[PDB]
Symmetry: D3
Subunit: 266 residues, 6 copies
């Protein structure tokens, strides 16, 4: 079960309004790698774990924190949309506002009454296909490192897309939390790799066709990847290199379908 306090985890108030920045911050709210993705991924993984409490609890702790970040980004967008221009009265007050209006999300005013959406900057709805919860935490802790990496890259970019020190104060807090999250998820990843194996899943080495498992195959005519040849991979075995990969599988010849399908193919 959850409980809520009205106080934000950390400040989320800009020094001044900016509806263009509000639109950019929709990426962190409703985007592919944003806070809603983190919230739903970590809570899903946490609820689905039957394993060690160390990781189950880490996931539920962090998913719950991400809900605080969803709240912060939402709040920041709302403050940034204060007094935003949306019609002829605004243009009569200051005709230069036409440029601002051109760059805004039309739906911020029309659909939401100058409030945040749960979409990205381009109005694409957040959706569950952005979420990963596979049942395997070696894989999913790697996913979580990536989620925080892609997110922290975006927050870093956002920092250079505003000069508002109130906006930047919030971003500086989020950058630091994303450092913590990257590090905690890397530690879990490394512990799980030691337990189960460096390759996911770790119990398939006998089954796989091992002769192809350490061969770098040169399918594009640049030769840059040849630098991996002879380097030692993380499992202790060296990469070999094939300059001219071979097509070993034959020519497909599937049986034509039943006439009731009307597969007229010449």
């Amino acid at each position: 079960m959850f409980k809520h306090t009205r106080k934000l985890q950390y400040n989320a108030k800009p020094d001044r309004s900016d509806p263009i920045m509000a639109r950019r911050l929709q990426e962190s709210l409703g985007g592919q790698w944003g806070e809603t993705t983190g919230m739903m991924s970590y809570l899903s993984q946490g609820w689905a774990s039957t394993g060690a409490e160390k990781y189950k609890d880490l996931l539920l702790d962090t998913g719950t924190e991400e809900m605080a970040h969803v709240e912060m980004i939402s709040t920041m967008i709302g403050y940034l949309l204060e007094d935003a221009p949306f019609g002829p009265e605004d243009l009569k007050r200051d005709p230069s506002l036409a440029t601002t209006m051109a760059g805004m999300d039309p739906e911020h005013s029309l659909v939401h009454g100058l409030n945040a959406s749960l979409n990205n900057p381009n109005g694409a709805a957040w959706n569950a296909g952005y979420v990963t919860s596979s049942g395997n935490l070696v894989a999913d802790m790697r996913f979580n490192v990536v989620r925080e990496s892609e997110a922290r890259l975006q927050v870093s970019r956002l920092y250079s897309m505003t000069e508002d020190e109130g906006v930047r104060d919030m971003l500086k807090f989020l950058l630091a939390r994303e450092t913590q999250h990257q590090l905690q998820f890397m530690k879990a990843q490394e512990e799980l790799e030691e337990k189960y194996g460096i390759i996911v899943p770790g119990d398939m080495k006998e089954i796989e066709h091992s002769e192809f498992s350490h061969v770098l195959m040169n399918f594009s005519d640049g030769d840059g990847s040849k630098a991996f040849e002879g380097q030692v991979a993380k499992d202790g075995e060296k990469f070999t290199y094939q300059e001219n990969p071979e097509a070993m599988g034959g020519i497909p010849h599937i049986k034509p379908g039943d006439p009731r399908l009307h597969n007229h193919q010449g």
Copy 2:
């Protein structure tokens, strides 16, 4: 530019038909973490790189290889759909085929003429939201390790979802290529982390609020995550632990919108 040969990279022919397995393999063709996601992600990242040839060429090599895997999965699905039941004549021939029909994708017959789709097992279209190309290869090589990890987990599951030795032969090849891809992307990741930093992006340490960068925050009442307290994180600094995270940001109070919005909120 690309060129094509009709020969497959490796065998993709089952010993017998199985339209239920064909539906499962749609995950590997049109699903979230499948071969189309790999193909499009690696090609995109490769095209978008202005950096080291070692990595640009690796990405183009591997993206091109994934096109061969898309071709293999497509081919295997087509063979597995041979003679699949789709109407009353088939049920008259063998009434037990009703169970098979109930588990099939209705669109395999109706839309595609007993051929593969570019959807997942549930008919959800493959879409570009599954693809990541960010401009930062520290982040994206981590993504690529995840893509191969989630994929190889699924391929491993598929191995236990059939007893067909022809299907399994293909899967054994793919498992091995996914081991190679996991390892080559991990090596690139490790080199890029040494160059740029273990936190992504590596050039924001002074900007972030460092006091919060190594604190584990206990938001869920389980205590499993306390086991991280005092462990040395990958950047050389120990994690600290906060039993009772504090709401530091105040209660938001956003300004009411202009009357032309009709924001009647009480």
Copy 3:
């Protein structure tokens, strides 16, 4: 069956072109709460009814009217796109059109030849997930009141987003029809609630855990909702209030899955 006349239900011609307003009006054509949603919802519900003709016919009457509104919005958008700028020759004519171009939907010209799309202002395709037809008209008449409420709110906003008297004339007609539709659907709602009950569905009172049916639970630390305590609800029973909701269900513990799933969770 349907028949069509080329004459519009009501005027849908603007005094002047304005491709920014055209983009806004895509909300009314292809958006979440727009006229296509109304058309498809009311027709679907009407076709699905096996009940009283008073309501079945109301739904078919109104769904058919909404088709006329779809036609009007489409027509208005096409007029509004007349002479819209789309390339260098327009900027040679009037360099000040750059601002207009920046705010336009790029697809209006490129994809549609300066004609309406079936997308919202952000290019998101209209989709059937916007439509409700459940089989229960107590629920669905409430939905229809909502549909007309959200739509009329948007139409009201649009009125303040232009000074064009021809656009406003059309909007004044739609506002009036939306008043009628809100009222007719509220009357149906109330008649259906008298027949079946104020709670949907009205035949589950013995089954539900009545102990929890009138309790306001305080999950967020604001105390504003305590004002509802002791007020009489629409069914004649007073609300009680719980300042500290209890977690009554225990800590879940699901069985670890079969090893064929490779659920490595620590």
Copy 4:
């Protein structure tokens, strides 16, 4: 900010596993009118309100409660998926499981390791297009009554889709909470209608073309809707009736576009 406890709001454990029922309950987790829709809609509306605390707090209270229901449905699905069949070893063990496998979501095993998804029963991803937050609480409290109405209808149907008394115990609780939520949102609706008006938005009566605001228009040739003629609408005015609605707007004639568009239309 939020905090989490591992204890569930109410019991969410079935007496027996049933992966077909797990698939149905995906509607309540990831579907159009499910608990994620409630959670995100009420939180969004609550965060976006600058108005009376009575309603802002009610929304945040209830949105936070819905997160507990998301957790319960997720948990129930996980328990229901225990020991679910997914490959040849299960059919070797008990060939009668083929019917169960045919009805399952293939991704429950393959993607999630016999855990819940954030999709509906058909694998369609939950998405933000299911959420409404408009800025007007007269409209949105009506939406919330609908959300709880469509949901409680689905929960009622689910009750008749299982004989498991453990599942039914959870459903009986949810039915009761949905009664409370319907009633509280109706009370807010009633207060807001008394304040602002029965038509949403309530400040446009002078602007609309009033001559069309109370006319029932007969567009479908059934006569059932004539029963509304002469009835008093909720705003105190009687409905009139038009047996033959007229097309008042003329035949549109839009200007042909610039030749650079290549609009070759004959």
Copy 5:
């Protein structure tokens, strides 16, 4: 404007129920190439035309007819869902219904109350990305031929997916109407090609690099396409053939981005 009659264009009643066939027919209602796609495409194109009345009227005539077909398919699905099994009480009166339940769309009962959806057989929502209206009727009449071709192929397949003579009677009518629609759209296509040219658009021959306009390029190593060499194309010019197409464009080298983007690429 539109008007509606309760009488269907043609019979749409099955001899007996069949919820599996109901699910198949969702392709014709909510699928990619189904009746909703035809309705919305032809109406959109018709509204958007400023050209010859012969074609504008044909489009509006046919789009309006397709609305009747939407109505018929919806009706047929509702009849086919009569008495469909959905819970434990159905299996008790007849246990052989288990296979039927396994093959049904779970949402037909749960969401819609045993009524049609606006989704395809897999639950994927109909969406406007299935619709084409480009402004060029040489292109769009070709699209319309295709829409009727793909649809009639599906109807033909459906004919072999049931033995119900009432279902078949409806399909025999639709097959005939799709013959008419293919033929009328082909006639329009041919007239428009005579007026504007066989290549769309017909006014770019001077602009294009003509040396590449009639060359078959052999990118896949099969030699089957060599059979086109020397054949006369529809514009009166012979195809030539290139066995080894050449990469003529150089190796791209794009400029690295500004450091504020953090594009760390090695």
Copy 6:
């Protein structure tokens, strides 16, 4: 299997940067009728063909060529995005850039680091619903002609949306390839229509209700379509014309559902 060369099929470098043109070109990369649609459609159809090598090889040759075009469009977008404005420091340098920034896709910088996406100009993700592969090549060759027609229309429009002669040189090449592809697919279409029939599928004439197969039905009150009356259709039979189409199928009445569904409809 595939192989890649770093050299482009044809030049794809602009004379100057232009991030607005970059956004337009996203239509050709990630849009409905763009190069990814062609690539995936032709490869899918080619892999799925069991018929004549002339057409199977044509499809694989062309699908492979379209991969080169995807690469070209990607490259062109990346060059066009060089030095694009994205933050306050750019506006300090030149305040005039505000108009450019307003028209840009915010995700080009924020998500991709000033690189191409796999979305259309509005940020809508490319998806597999844009792809057709049906099993019948009479239908699908028609689709392919359409694909190349809609695409060449868009490329022709793009030609009038820039004055950059480097962009135009690329477009001139693509126009010529689209002429070739339109012609080769029309030739295949013609040959297949001679073999199987002018109506798709060509083996249903006895089954369909022939009396309705050549009747133009006047559902919209314009009279333009009467011009088809008496013209000879492509199968050699004349069209007839029905001024007042009749509703022949009666008024349906579906049985009310079981009470367990709670279908309260009045």
